[model samples]
Target chain A: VLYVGSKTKEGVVHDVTTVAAKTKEQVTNVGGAVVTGVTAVAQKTVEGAGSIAAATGFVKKDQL
Target chain B: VLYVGSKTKEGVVHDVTTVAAKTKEQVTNVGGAVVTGVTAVAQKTVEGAGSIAAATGFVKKDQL
Candidate 1:
């Protein structure tokens, strides 16, 4: 099954089927560190916190 | 922009603002390094390897 992770605050997930799938380095040197930050957020805020949005902690764990 | 992460497959976001945000523990517990795992499953399959409802990785950086 294909699982979509999340949508932006504007309520949409990016699907660029308009173009053929391209290969490029995202160069996410500082794109909010989305993947890492998000995983940290979920780890910090356990499930009972009511919502994933409740996660507001930052993680700098072993970032070498 | 405030980005919100995943909603369970049921597609509902939880809110508990009826409660107050209490003071957090003034002291934080520094956990033992999380290098404490046997292999596990991936929540969403990456590399098409279906496993957990979460991420799993075996970090083995060589001393170059």
Candidate 2:
């Protein structure tokens, strides 16, 4: 995802997700920021899964 | 990139993007935050790409 804002108010919902080259630039130009931060809930290592994967955060900044 | 905080001012640049067992936990410990985030614009049922593919925000995050 691409963003062009000083900061984003929303988290992941505002990102382009997997964006194309041209579209990415468009987001940044429009003051969009990648709000979807990645966090590890579980992994594929340590007798578990350690496969590195990026999933949107379950947390949201919505108060509305 | 490793971050420690309830809130990060900057965006994520270099992360384990993929990490190991030891490093992953170390990040959680020191408050190492992963700034990179992901969202599902579309499912895994496509070939020529979908709306999800063309939906990246663009710019500062740079194209592709």
Candidate 3:
């Protein structure tokens, strides 16, 4: 997990998960913000998640 | 400036600017993507900037 910015006016968060041969991830942003999530599997499983809020931008999760 | 993720599947970027009592910023993400930007200012001058591409997430700029 990773986080950036302020809890009151700018923030970004990210989380990720993976298993065997798969991966999954999530991200969130608040205030002029953006969030994203992705999941992939190929005989395995994975997960990712996160959040951001208030005058902030950018968060990412990846699986490969 | 900040960047994360792969050049092929996931990416995140951020940029910002400020002048004499204002602030401005920007962010971008690709592949399961998210992007954000903010701007503000007061009495001086400042700037922030960044970019992301492909499979990735998360970038931030702040001015106060």
Candidate 4:
């Protein structure tokens, strides 16, 4: 899902999904180094953080 | 613009804009630290990369 929102002095919060689909064909050229497998790592990280945000009501179930 | 595409053995390439809109209200909580001002930084980085990609024909003018 797309993340669309704004931030504030208190903190930044928004409603979005944690899923980041990646395929083997996916790679990013960073500093001349072809980076792979980073998307998977990011997916996991987003999942964990999303869970926390959901638990705290920062993210509603319908948003998921 | 949204980045949607797949990767290949050659490399990952996609057609999308580099603009990332950010507002002052934005902030992200990472590692218990409320990170701020990152979106602006990211905006510049994306802009530079997008320019390079456009010049290299990776990103078309219409996409911009």
Candidate 5:
């Protein structure tokens, strides 16, 4: 699944993807702090939600 | 992008969304071997860092 959120061509390319790419580095450097952000993007992307989409809030317990 | 880390519930009562749900089956039948953990509940739900929330880790690089 995939979603193209409210971004212009340049916006998605320059801003959103760029932020996602940057977050990858942060995922390595920032650790848990940046994970939520990563997961957020991943969620929206999976659901095909547009940019700036709201996340579906749900999760399994023990896994925490 | 959506980012709801840290959850508290029995879990998202299964997704009805098509692609998301099919991925959920993949998450199940495949027994979560890692689409980043069946894209970690790949659904309207997503991957949580600690597994305490939606596990969202699915997306295309180009799409990003």
Candidate 6:
């Protein structure tokens, strides 16, 4: 419902790309000299999740 | 949290399974001659998040 028009390729792709880019910057631009270990892990997990999210559109259920 | 009753299977299962099926179709049914776009990724991402959010209900801090 939040993404009705996303029925098209153009609809979903742009949103994912923008979210991925923004989140990556957030992960890399943490304040302080050193990134705390847990914080780094969380950020990395979210970043990776974003990539998976981006790729999910192309996944064929039968292929899985 | 958006998913409070997710502490129980009966609660989360209904929501996630519903969302997953719905989003999958949205990803597949693109309009205007081609599926050229990013909307699918975001939809699938949300579907996956629904799955994760359901599971997070069971994750114990001590397990980490």
* Candidate achieving the largest lDDT: 3
Cα lDDT for residue B15, model 5? 27
TM-score of chain B of each: 0.23, 0.16, 0.15, 0.19, 0.15, 0.14
For model 6, the stretches where C-alpha displacement exceeds 4 angstroms are A1-51, B1-33, B37-64
lDDT of 4 by residue, A1-64 (tens): 2223322122122222233232324222322222121111001112222122111101112322
| lDDT of residue B8 for candidate 4 | 17
Alpha carbon lDDT of residue A54, candidate 3? 24
Residue A40 of model 4: what lDDT? 12
Angstrom error of the Cα, residue A7, model 1: value is 17
Q: Candidate 1 at residue B59, lDDT? A: 25
The predicted structure with the larger DockQ, 1 or 2, is 2
- The parts of candidate 2 lying over 4 Å away from their true place are A1-30, A38-64, B1-35, B38-42, B47-64
> How big is the positional error of residue A58 in model 4, measured in Å on the Cα after superposition?
30
CAPRI-style quality class for the chain A–B interface of candidate 6: incorrect
True contacts kept of 5: 0.02
| DockQ scores for all predicted structures | 0.04, 0.04, 0.05, 0.02, 0.04, 0.03
C-alpha lDDT values of all predictions: 0.24, 0.26, 0.27, 0.21, 0.25, 0.20
Model 2, position A38: C-alpha lDDT score: 37
**lDDT tens readout by residue for model 2, B1-64:** 2222233322222223322222122122121112234433322222231112222333212133
**Model 5, B1-64: lDDT tens per residue?**
3323322222232222212211112122121112221122332344333232342422212222
Candidate 1 vs candidate 4, lDDT winner: 1
Q: Candidate 4's residue-wise lDDT over B28-53, tens digit each?
A: 23222221111110011112221221
lDDT of 1 at A41: 14
Cα RMSD for predicted model 5: 18.4
Q: Candidate 3 lDDT, tens digit per residue, B1-64? A: 2223222211211223212222233433343335322222111111233222222233434332
TM-score of each: 0.19, 0.17, 0.15, 0.16, 0.15, 0.15
